Amino acid sequence: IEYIHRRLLGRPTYDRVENNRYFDIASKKGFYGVVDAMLNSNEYQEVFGEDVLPYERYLTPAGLSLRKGRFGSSDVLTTPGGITPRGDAARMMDKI
Amino acid sequence: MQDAITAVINNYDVQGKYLDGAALDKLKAYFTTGAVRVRAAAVISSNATTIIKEAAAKALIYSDLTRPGGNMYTTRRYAACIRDMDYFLRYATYAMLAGDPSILDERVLNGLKETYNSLGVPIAATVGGIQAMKEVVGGLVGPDAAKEASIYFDYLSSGLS
Amino acid sequence: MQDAITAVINNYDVQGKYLDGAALDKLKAYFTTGAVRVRAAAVISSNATTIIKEAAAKALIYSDLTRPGGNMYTTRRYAACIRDMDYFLRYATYAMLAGDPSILDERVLNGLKETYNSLGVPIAATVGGIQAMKEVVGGLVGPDAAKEASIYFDYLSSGLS
Amino acid sequence: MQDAITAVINNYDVQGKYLDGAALDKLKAYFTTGAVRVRAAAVISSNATTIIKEAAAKALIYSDLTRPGGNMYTTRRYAACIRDMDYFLRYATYAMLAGDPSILDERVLNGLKETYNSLGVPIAATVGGIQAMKEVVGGLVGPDAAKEASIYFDYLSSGLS
Amino acid sequence: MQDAITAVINNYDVQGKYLDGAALDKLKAYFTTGAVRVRAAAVISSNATTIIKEAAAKALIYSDLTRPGGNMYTTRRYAACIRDMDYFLRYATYAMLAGDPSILDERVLNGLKETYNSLGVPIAATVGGIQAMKEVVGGLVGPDAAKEASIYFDYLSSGLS
Amino acid sequence: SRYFKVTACIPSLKRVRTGRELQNTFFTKLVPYENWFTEQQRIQKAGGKVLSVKLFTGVQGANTGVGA
Amino acid sequence: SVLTKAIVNADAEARYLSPGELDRIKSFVASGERRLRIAQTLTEARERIVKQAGDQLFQIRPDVVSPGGNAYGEKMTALCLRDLDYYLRLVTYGIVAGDVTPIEEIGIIGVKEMYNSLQTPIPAVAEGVRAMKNVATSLLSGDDAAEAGFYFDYLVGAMQ
Amino acid sequence: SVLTKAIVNADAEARYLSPGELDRIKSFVASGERRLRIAQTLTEARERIVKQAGDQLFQIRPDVVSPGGNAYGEKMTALCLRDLDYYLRLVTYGIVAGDVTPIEEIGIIGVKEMYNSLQTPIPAVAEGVRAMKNVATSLLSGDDAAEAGFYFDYLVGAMQ
Amino acid sequence: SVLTKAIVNADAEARYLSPGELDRIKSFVASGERRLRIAQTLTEARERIVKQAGDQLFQIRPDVVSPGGNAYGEKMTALCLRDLDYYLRLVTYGIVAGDVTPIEEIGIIGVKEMYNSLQTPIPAVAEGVRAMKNVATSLLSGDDAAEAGFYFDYLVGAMQ
Amino acid sequence: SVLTKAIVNADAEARYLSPGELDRIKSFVASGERRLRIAQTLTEARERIVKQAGDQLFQIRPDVVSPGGNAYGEKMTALCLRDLDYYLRLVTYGIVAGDVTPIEEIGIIGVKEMYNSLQTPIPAVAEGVRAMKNVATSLLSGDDAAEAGFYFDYLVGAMQ
Amino acid sequence: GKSELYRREFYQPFINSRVLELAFKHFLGRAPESRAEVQKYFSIISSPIVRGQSSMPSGGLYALIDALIDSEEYTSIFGEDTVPYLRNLGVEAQPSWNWGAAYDLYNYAAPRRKVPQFITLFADYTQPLPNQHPYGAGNDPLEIQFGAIFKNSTINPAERAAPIGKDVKRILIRNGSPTSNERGNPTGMSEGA
Numbered sequence A: 001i002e003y004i005h006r007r008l009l010g011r012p013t014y015d016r017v018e019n020n021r022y023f024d025i026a027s028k029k030g031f032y033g034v035v036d037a038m039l040n041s042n043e044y045q046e047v048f049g050e051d052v053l054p055y056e057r058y059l060t061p062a063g064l065s066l067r068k069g070r071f072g073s074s075d076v077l078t079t080p081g082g083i084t085p086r087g088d089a090a091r092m093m094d095k096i
Numbered sequence B, C, D, E: 001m002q003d004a005i006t007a008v009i010n011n012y013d014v015q016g017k018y019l020d021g022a023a024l025d026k027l028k029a030y031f032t033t034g035a036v037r038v039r040a041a042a043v044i045s046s047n048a049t050t051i052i053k054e055a056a057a058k059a060l061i062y063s064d065l066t067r068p069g070g071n072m073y074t075t076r077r078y079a080a081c082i083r084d085m086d087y088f089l090r091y092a093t094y095a096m097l098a099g100d101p102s103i104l105d106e107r108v109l110n111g112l113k114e115t116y117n118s119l120g121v122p123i124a125a126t127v128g129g130i131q132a133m134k135e136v137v138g139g140l141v142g143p144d145a146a147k148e149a150s151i152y153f154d155y156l157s158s159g160l161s
Numbered sequence F: 001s002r003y004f005k006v007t008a009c010i011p012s013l014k015r016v017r018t019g020r021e022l023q024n025t026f027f028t029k030l031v032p033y034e035n036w037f038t039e040q041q042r043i044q045k046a047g048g049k050v051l052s053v054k055l056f057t058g059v060q061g062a063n064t065g066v067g068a
Numbered sequence G, H, I, J: 001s002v003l004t005k006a007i008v009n010a011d012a013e014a015r016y017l018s019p020g021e022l023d024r025i026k027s028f029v030a031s032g033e034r035r036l037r038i039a040q041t042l043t044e045a046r047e048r049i050v051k052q053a054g055d056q057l058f059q060i061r062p063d064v065v066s067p068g069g070n071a072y073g074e075k076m077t078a079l080c081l082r083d084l085d086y087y088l089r090l091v092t093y094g095i096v097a098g099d100v101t102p103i104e105e106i107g108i109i110g111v112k113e114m115y116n117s118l119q120t121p122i123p124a125v126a127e128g129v130r131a132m133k134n135v136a137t138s139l140l141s142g143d144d145a146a147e148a149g150f151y152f153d154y155l156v157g158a159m160q
Numbered sequence K: 001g002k003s004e005l006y007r008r009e010f011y012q013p014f015i016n017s018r019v020l021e022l023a024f025k026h027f028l029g030r031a032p033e034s035r036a037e038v039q040k041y042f043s044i045i046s047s048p049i050v051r052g053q054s055s056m057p058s059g060g061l062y063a064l065i066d067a068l069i070d071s072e073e074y075t076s077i078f079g080e081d082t083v084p085y086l087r088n089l090g091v092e093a094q095p096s097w098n099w100g101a102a103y104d105l106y107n108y109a110a111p112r113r114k115v116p117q118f119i120t121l122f123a124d125y126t127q128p129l130p131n132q133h134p135y136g137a138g139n140d141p142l143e144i145q146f147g148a149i150f151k152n153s154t155i156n157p158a159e160r161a162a163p164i165g166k167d168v169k170r171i172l173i174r175n176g177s178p179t180s181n182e183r184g185n186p187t188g189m190s191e192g193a
């Protein structure tokens, strides 16, 4: 159910309520009950309409750290008002 | 999510008891402070944007955050950061109205730490912004709801840090 | 764990095959660069503390990580972070010497991601520190073993993220 | 484990501020309520065993828990009670001596539901037993010190259920 | 993803600097080799199926892989292995055209090692097949873009191994 | 297994779409019998008008042979 | 409660509570003492209400206490009476809360599946609830009777 | 850039690049020296452009630099000129990249929210960008002037 | 705190709080007002104490503020003064807690590793803490001066 | 204040406090809590209110900040903002006192002579007070906004 | 313990934080019971030299095994003659704050788990809910193009649970412009692309 949700709608599940609504349909109608219930949601019509193909909309941070994240973060956390000597040597070298 | 009244009802139902004197006193304890909470919530809703503006001015902008190399650099990241500030303010208002940080635990802090670590957001800077918003809100609301407002901002800050 | 020679040996023993010409080329290719690895390992072992200090100064400190609410706030957390950096440097040196990341998989990466997720450690900042250590080590050891050193630091970073 | 004194310091340390008026008010309130806690701790002690016996008679015994099939049907199941209890006393006497939930969440009420689910042990029954001791300790301790003991007992019962 | 031009633009945008002599030199260095990359991409696209055929013939088939007990046994697994080989070739072409391996990092290598470990796919055999396509592509494209195409195949092989 | 030949016109009032919504506003399409209810209710709640409906697949009074 | 329902809609729209919602909360907290009074009265008179509702349901349909009935026997009927007590407690909770979230989450969702599994007549349970409706409204003033009976009718509707 | 757009489209389609995409890549790589020359010209003339943009901006909308104005005071005008310099930098980035992707990621998405929070006249900033466009086009040949004016016009239109 | 050190000590033996521990907890709650007053007095004069202590430290050990010194430069000196302020804050925390439990976990465990990594003179930091102790004891009565100074000597001994 | 206006009025007849005056003194002491809270809320936001009121005033009456204007120049503008802060302080004093007696003696009697001597536009100052009223009522609930604005309208009427 | 046979078997294949949890079950007949205990024993293992008194044959496994064997608890229960034995439910008073974790360690499939469990559990007790599936953490598949991986929880147990409840709404990252997350912008899927 969780994998089919990502394929049919561009996001993983949000809530235990959202998971249970499809679970209690899968226990009564099976695979066709789950897929039909997913494709007949108000969210599908609101987002994808009737001409647009479904597309990936949201990512979990675990997945987002897989696509990016290799070689880490090069930005260095900057923080406001901190005391930092970074760049002073380069500025002095340019002034010289 | 759960509030004072629903919390009392649930913590009596799971033990299968009826509403006794202790739960009754708890519920009138919530009821007596109803007007102060709603007045503070109305004030916060009316002054939402000004609070975020002043908190950002005091804690975030005019620093290395908004310069290149800072996380708050670029219009996209600036808009996202002020959106996050609005998130924290609105959920603090909901928690103050309901008299319970359960909404903060369920819908704010769950996985927020790992999400911020994945995105590279400065958590210390976020906590500083939350405290600036708390100071401004305590200024606006007054002593009547200043403490009740401050406890949920402090809960958010302690959860994040 | 396994090095290049033992890796070839197991790769042939699983097939039940006497080691052939191709295995001979693989072994010769490792044997050709034996001395450079030893020299690089000696240099890294001699300059262990300086590499960690320079990498920390370049990538970690003077940030919000070291300010209150940061992850490496307090002396205990600072010591723990530099201890983790020393762990990474030592196991990178072992991987350079063995010519195989099997020791990195066995003794570093298995479960470290989940431990960091539970503890709230910023994995992105940790990988940035590892990359800074990689730059410093590549500077120290010279072109001869700089690439060979860099491949295992990249392995550690990719495994962590 | 934390008390009020340690809790305020820990909360004010992550944000790096000196102890201001609000912190000094919280610490002052605890210091002013520091004698009734000590007296009621000694009152809970000494009369501990009679408290447990009265609570057991009031809630546990005279029910299905003693008939064949119950989880207190024989002795040694009865003996695991008085034990099981004496905790929920002991602890929360610690709580109303270093007043903060903290200890009650870290030592007693943490995985207790899992252990009870794996061992049988009716949780509703063991929560009714807690409320019985709440009543008996409120009776024995006094008018004003009946509260905050009621607070910690209610926290224990609510957390368990 | 990023190409050389967007990589330089981002590297200067993070510093908030206008494009200077060094950045312009890097951009000119990319623009000089523009047509060679396009010709190599056209040649690879035209010879896509043949490249996979010789690579499989020289590296995979006629071995224990295609026999019973081999991972590449059965028509399903054979089609899967050739599809993966095609994916590697196509993304190598994309990376060669863009002059930057960020698309390889973001769209192929992410979790590929853990996926192959979970499925039992031999990473050593996959690396051998990738190198076989590297030799075939280097033969087809000629000296002009052989090394440029080869560096990205080496990137994929090192990322897997 | 029955279907429906449906012609409908859906006007989007408050969106104002910049590019080519003939194919989205007015359209005719085939829909299965088991989804015609949801499709009709989708059209109604958006202010659309259902111009025409045709059976196109089944028989009027089939007790059997109509299984999904 | 009304607080939870207002907060849920505000969170769904990503906006602070409207002035109308704040006025609704103010009115609800104003009506709190009346709601507590009705709940206290029903709690004090619950046992007689349960017994009379049971008698009314049984003489409306005596078949449930028949040999082929679900509630045949002393311990079989004690369970039905305990269930009626359960829904009376739930409607008291709903009265104090101000809207039907606790009743919905405790006693109507999945009730169809549970009663189908137990083979108990759901329409008979609904009539038994309506008997509790009559007995409870007999012990309250007119507007209090309307207030409690609105929740009772909610339970009656939610049953079927 | 154009390469990123073409490769993204091909990858999303799961296909090799079309010959039309290859032709546009060839055209982009051919025009590279001219684009670099235009970027060099703008970068070398960056300071005069910003100063003149400030002068015509303050002439056209004097209320902006006025006591109840967002940029009254010497440092508030310094920040306004700094923003103008930022947008000129992004325009040079867009010219070098051959499209509007860098401008969109760095300085357009969320600009409405940021400037609404800061309480600054977005139409005033648009007029400043147009003044920068005029000053820049007065320093270029006709083809290069049109090429830079396309990106300046997109910036003005997007700030709307 | 003393409450932490007393309650957990009587929890490792599975007994209630000892009658020997239904004492000095009592002395702590009795002296809580004095401890709070001393902590507030130190907090009010935090900037003067830090400034004068840094002055005395830089006179006593001028090598650190020399070109070959760890704290050479205006911002390196700012960091040194920030560390001194941190240790003053930890001392106030210890004073209010009544035990050196919080300052130990916050700023002592691992301090040797941190300062060795940063290449800072630990004896110089200890002398700075001593100067802070002298300046703080200059602002307090004799009993309170001894009470704060005892924690100051704890910090000096621990950084050793 | 109300107490001064009531006691001295029942002292000019040589009688005790009137039974009609052992009232609205009563409502004054009852509403003193709300008055103190409103005064504190205005006091916390004194700088923002003054800044925004000055901004609105300088837009609506730009002639004062022109070369021929009384408040032309950075320090003459600082003096105008200082006067606005003075009047906000007087308004808070009036709110706490419950009567405009203190504000009347402090900043209204002779204000015409003072501003005529200094050659300042009294209508401009009145408009500045109106802008301060708008900014203040933007930060308060309806009842408290009306209460503060009633004193603000007193200032506007008196400066006339 | 310090022999080569134990080093090759229970020190090579595992992480240091897992070697601590296995050594606790091997030389003490119980699991680690507190977060402070794990810090102490990990800081004992991790450093090249700790030394106690005088000599320095105290590196990793050797230092940890000495610290475990010389502990007050060991020489009070299994003192000097008794082979250590499992102090499970029958033998001693069982702690309840790590019941499920400890009874997984006591099983003979304990060495088959490489992901550390006790340091993760003691860290989870003092932090907010991790963001994962509302069910177990192995329920969310790998986010690749067409994988559907779903780690097995039998091939290599790394089971991780968390009390999620029913109203906990997950936090998802927006694959696009940040200001269209649909949680602070109710109409975000309809604005541009």
Ligand SMILES: *C[C@@H](*)[C@H]1/C(=C/c2[nH]c(/C=C3N=C(/C=C4\NC(=O)C(CC)=C4C)C(C)=C\3CCC(=O)O)c(CCC(=O)O)c2C)NC(=O)[C@@H]1C
Pocket (backbone or CB within 6 Å): C060, C065, C071, C072, C077, C078, C080, C081, C082, C084, C085, C087, C107, C108, C112, C115, C119, C121, C122, C125, C126, C129, K015, K016, K017, K018, K038, K039, K042, K119
């Ligand atoms: C650059 C340092 C970053 C950082 C680190 C940090 N780590 C911890 C705690 C632990 N780190 C480990 C690590 C390992 N165990 C292993 O077996 C290996 C490989 C062999 C590693 C790398 C463990 C197990 C712990 C937990 C035990 C402990 O607390 O000592 C901490 C402390 C967190 C806390 O206070 O709870 C930190 C801060 N933090 C950063 O910000 C840096 C980027």
Ligand SMILES: *C[C@@H](*)[C@H]1/C(=C/c2[nH]c(/C=C3N=C(/C=C4\NC(=O)C(CC)=C4C)C(C)=C\3CCC(=O)O)c(CCC(=O)O)c2C)NC(=O)[C@@H]1C
Pocket (backbone or CB within 6 Å): G064, G070, G071, G076, G079, G080, G081, G083, G084, G086, G087, G106, G107, G118, G120, G121, G124, G125, G128
């Ligand atoms: C008016 C009574 C009708 C009736 C009832 C009946 N009930 C049972 C058994 C159970 N009923 C419940 C009910 C609830 N659990 C809940 O949590 C709630 C809401 C809070 C309800 C209403 C349950 C759990 C049981 C199981 C037994 C138990 O819990 O002890 C039975 C027994 C079934 C049997 O056939 O053995 C009956 C008969 N029967 C009638 O005829 C009445 C209309």
Ligand SMILES: *C[C@@H](*)[C@H]1/C(=C/c2[nH]c(/C=C3N=C(/C=C4\NC(=O)C(CC)=C4C)C(C)=C\3CCC(=O)O)c(CCC(=O)O)c2C)NC(=O)[C@@H]1C
Pocket (backbone or CB within 6 Å): C061, C062, C063, C066, C067, C072, C073, C074, C075, C078, I064, I069, I070, I071, I076, I079, I080, I081, I083, I084, I086, I087, I106, I107, I118, I120, I121, I124, I125, I128
């Ligand atoms: C009197 C000043 C002495 C001195 C100090 C000095 N410190 C640094 C850098 C740092 N100091 C700290 C300190 C702490 N972090 C904590 O969590 C605590 C406990 C509360 C302390 C005390 C840290 C983290 C740093 C790193 C930088 C940062 O804060 O981000 C330096 C800078 C050295 C350098 O090479 O950069 C100095 C000089 N130096 C002296 O000579 C004095 C004795």
Ligand SMILES: *[C@H](C)[C@H]1/C(=C/c2[nH]c(/C=C3N=C(/C=C4\NC(=O)C(CC)=C4C)C(C)=C\3CCC(=O)O)c(CCC(=O)O)c2C)NC(=O)[C@@H]1C
Pocket (backbone or CB within 6 Å): D060, D065, D070, D071, D072, D073, D076, D077, D078, D080, D081, D082, D084, D085, D087, D107, D108, D109, D112, D115, D119, D121, D122, D123, D125, D126, D129, K089, K093, K094, K095, K096, K097
């Ligand atoms: C008594 C009112 C109820 C009851 C209880 C019962 N408990 C057990 C067994 C155990 N209870 C515990 C409890 C704890 N360990 C802790 O560390 C803490 C907090 C500090 C608690 C609360 C544990 C761990 C056990 C198992 C080991 C042991 O016995 O010490 C039993 C025995 C079950 C059996 O026979 O196996 C019982 C009966 N039973 C009732 O009927 C009451 C509702």
Ligand SMILES: *[C@H](C)[C@H]1/C(=C/c2[nH]c(/C=C3N=C(/C=C4\NC(=O)C(CC)=C4C)C(C)=C\3CCC(=O)O)c(CCC(=O)O)c2C)NC(=O)[C@@H]1C
Pocket (backbone or CB within 6 Å): E065, E071, E072, E076, E077, E078, E080, E081, E082, E084, E085, E087, E107, E108, E109, E112, E115, E119, E121, E122, E123, E125, E126, E129, K144, K145, K146, K147, K148
């Ligand atoms: C071929 C040279 C080798 C080989 C491969 C093999 N792979 C699978 C199955 C999968 N391969 C993938 C691959 C990818 N997903 C991605 O997102 C990317 C990059 C964009 C890649 C490369 C995945 C996800 C699967 C699993 C799903 C699927 O089967 O489609 C198999 C099939 C295994 C099986 O039958 O279960 C095989 C055989 N096998 C060899 O022997 C070669 C060394």
Ligand SMILES: *[C@H](C)[C@H]1/C(=C/c2[nH]c(/C=C3N=C(/C=C4\NC(=O)C(CC)=C4C)C(C)=C\3CCC(=O)O)c(CCC(=O)O)c2C)NC(=O)[C@@H]1C
Pocket (backbone or CB within 6 Å): F010, F011, F012, F013, F016, F017, F019, F020, F021, F022, F023, F024, F025, F026
């Ligand atoms: C303007 C000169 C005249 C006019 C027009 C008018 N049109 C609509 C609504 C629509 N127009 C379209 C057009 C298209 N959809 C497509 O797919 C394309 C391809 C490019 C076109 C040309 C359609 C289908 C609609 C309906 C949906 C929508 O609104 O987008 C309206 C509004 C009608 C309404 O209120 O529903 C109007 C007013 N009106 C005049 O007076 C002019 C003569």
Ligand SMILES: *[C@H](C)[C@H]1/C(=C/c2[nH]c(/C=C3N=C(/C=C4\NC(=O)C(CC)=C4C)C(C)=C\3CCC(=O)O)c(CCC(=O)O)c2C)NC(=O)[C@@H]1C
Pocket (backbone or CB within 6 Å): B061, B062, B063, B066, B067, B072, B073, B074, B075, B078, H064, H065, H069, H070, H071, H076, H077, H079, H080, H081, H083, H084, H086, H087, H106, H107, H118, H120, H121, H124, H125, H128
């Ligand atoms: C100038 C022509 C107009 C103007 C501008 C103005 N801007 C600010 C303050 C800021 N502007 C920015 C801008 C950006 N951040 C980014 O990342 C980008 C994309 C490259 C931009 C454009 C920011 C972040 C700020 C905040 C302060 C800071 O930079 O740290 C001000 C100051 C407003 C204030 O209240 O202080 C002004 C005046 N004002 C005008 O009237 C002109 C039309």
Ligand SMILES: *[C@H](C)[C@H]1/C(=C/c2[nH]c(/C=C3N=C(/C=C4\NC(=O)C(CC)=C4C)C(C)=C\3CCC(=O)O)c(CCC(=O)O)c2C)NC(=O)[C@@H]1C
Pocket (backbone or CB within 6 Å): B060, B065, B071, B072, B076, B077, B078, B080, B081, B082, B084, B085, B087, B088, B091, B107, B108, B109, B112, B115, B119, B121, B122, B125, B126, B129, K170, K171, K172, K173, K174, K177, K178, K179, K180, K181, K183
């Ligand atoms: C602002 C003061 C700080 C800051 C923040 C920042 N956040 C993001 C992106 C996101 N923030 C969230 C947050 C939440 N989603 C939720 O549901 C909740 C609970 C109410 C929160 C707190 C998320 C999910 C994202 C990513 C997805 C999205 O955009 O919706 C950014 C943008 C990062 C980027 O550029 O990709 C920023 C900048 N940055 C600072 O510097 C401040 C300290």
Ligand SMILES: CCC1=C(C)/C(=C/C2=NC(=C\c3[nH]c(/C=C4\NC(=O)[C@H](C)[C@H]4CC)c(C)c3CCC(=O)O)/C(CCC(=O)O)=C2C)NC1=O
Pocket (backbone or CB within 6 Å): D061, D062, D066, D073, D074, D075, D078
């Ligand atoms: C099979 C071994 C065994 C026994 C016998 C046992 C007994 C037992 N007797 C109990 C109580 C009780 N038992 C008695 C009385 C008596 N008890 C006697 O053996 C006498 C015949 C009689 C007195 C003459 C009373 C009065 C109580 C209530 C508790 C109380 O005395 O306060 C209880 C406490 C729970 C309850 O109230 O039922 C237990 C567990 N459990 C065991 O495992």
